[PDB]
């Protein structure tokens, strides 16, 4: 949880919605095709001419010591590649990139990669599941794309937590706060639907879904003792 | 919930993790690169050489009076071609769309899409918020993706439900079967964390995550009376 800059390799729709969701930060976006400017300009970004498998072009985007690295690029071949260049530079740096096939998913992780994620799969999921109904669908696309009514939400458990020590049963967050918890995190484990006798901790990151007024009520639930 | 044929118009990977979850089904895949062929076909399908924005080649595909029409092209622009081609043979078979641009999601509806699902949105998103977790990314990717530990589910509920008229509070699912509730589903409108007062009707459609035994319990909970 620092606040440095974001360096962000190649350009997609993905890169684009990502972006919006960092408008409010210093981030670097390293592209060869120079049309893009433009877009990452009017967006508050900064723009770096070049190309992310070159380690040179890597290097004055400033992903070393950068908060995280986002890669995806035309091909999974190219974020591979762009990777390496990027533990070349920095082997600690945090690395997310975008894995457009399953069997890539490994090799992506083992050039590098801290977190992987695959769209295609995800898509095609979704697909063939709204042959019939689009609940499941409706439900995904309102949550994590258009965040409409509800969205899904990472709350760290601040030292001197009032849950601090409580059991998820005791903690009751659902029907006090109408958040639905859906895991927590610890040492980047993820238990997703953790047994009523388990006690949190601080540091912990309760992960729940809700409405932004519900995630609001938690966030004071969660508050340390004063 | 009707069990006729499945119509994919275009390749490509969300195309071929789709075509693995319909792995026991009719279905019919349209394309005009011939390459993909020997996919198709190592994988239960039809192919058909054709182009999905060419009302005859749809046709050919079978998609009048098919259960539903699978779109995904190499543009928001061909997607929407073919759609109102699809309209044009069948304007009641159900469409299902894969949106790159969010800006696109509105016009495939207005041409007839039934349901839209925007990946890179989707992705974009889950990147933006990975920068220093990925629990929220861990949760996604493994029931959406890689359905590992948990998976989502619909739980369609018959006429003579033991829920039947049961509201949500006293049915206590997910204390029962273990199994998160995460909404009901009833004429294509979806509650995402309905009330604990609601209570439910046999043609509704739960949507919940769990694993495959919770969501087996599940099932033998809204089972009917004998």
Redesign the interface.
């Known amino acids: ?2 606040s440095r800059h ?1 360096v962000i390799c190649g350009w ?11 408008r409010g930060s210093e981030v670097f976006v390293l592209a060869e095709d120079e049309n893009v400017r433009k877009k990452v300009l009017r967006s508050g970004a900064n723009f770096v001419h070049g190309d992310p498998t070159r380690v040179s072009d890597l290097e004055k985007a400033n992903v070393r010591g950068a ?2 690295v ?1 890669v ?1 690029l035309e091909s999974d071949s190219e974020t591979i590649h762009c990777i390496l260049g990027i533990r070349k530079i920095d082997e600690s740096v ?1 690395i ?1 990139a ?1 894995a ?3 069997e890539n998913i490994e090799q992506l992780r083992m050039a590098g990669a ?34 409409s ?2 969205r ?3 709350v760290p458990i601040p030292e001197g937590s009032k849950l601090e020590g409580v059991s998820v049963l005791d903690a009751d967050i659902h029907d006090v706060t ?1 958040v ?1 918890i ?2 927590v ?1 610890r040492g ?1 484990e ?1 238990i ?2 953790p047994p009523r006798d388990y006690s949190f901790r601080a540091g912990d ?1 309760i ?1 729940g ?2 409405k932004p007024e519900e995630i609001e009520r938690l966030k004071n639930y969660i508050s340390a003792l004063v």
């Open positions: 949880a620092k974001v997609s729709e993905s890169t684009l919605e990502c972006l919006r969701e960092l908060r995280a986002i995806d945090r997310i975008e457009e096939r399953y801290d977190q992987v994620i695959s769209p295609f799969v995800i898509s095609g999921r979704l697909m063939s599941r709204s042959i019939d109904d689009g609940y499941e669908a409706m439900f995904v696309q309102d949550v994590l794309a258009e965040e009514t509800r899904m939400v990472e109408g639905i859906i895991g995190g980047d993820l997703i639907d990151i992960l879904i809700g």
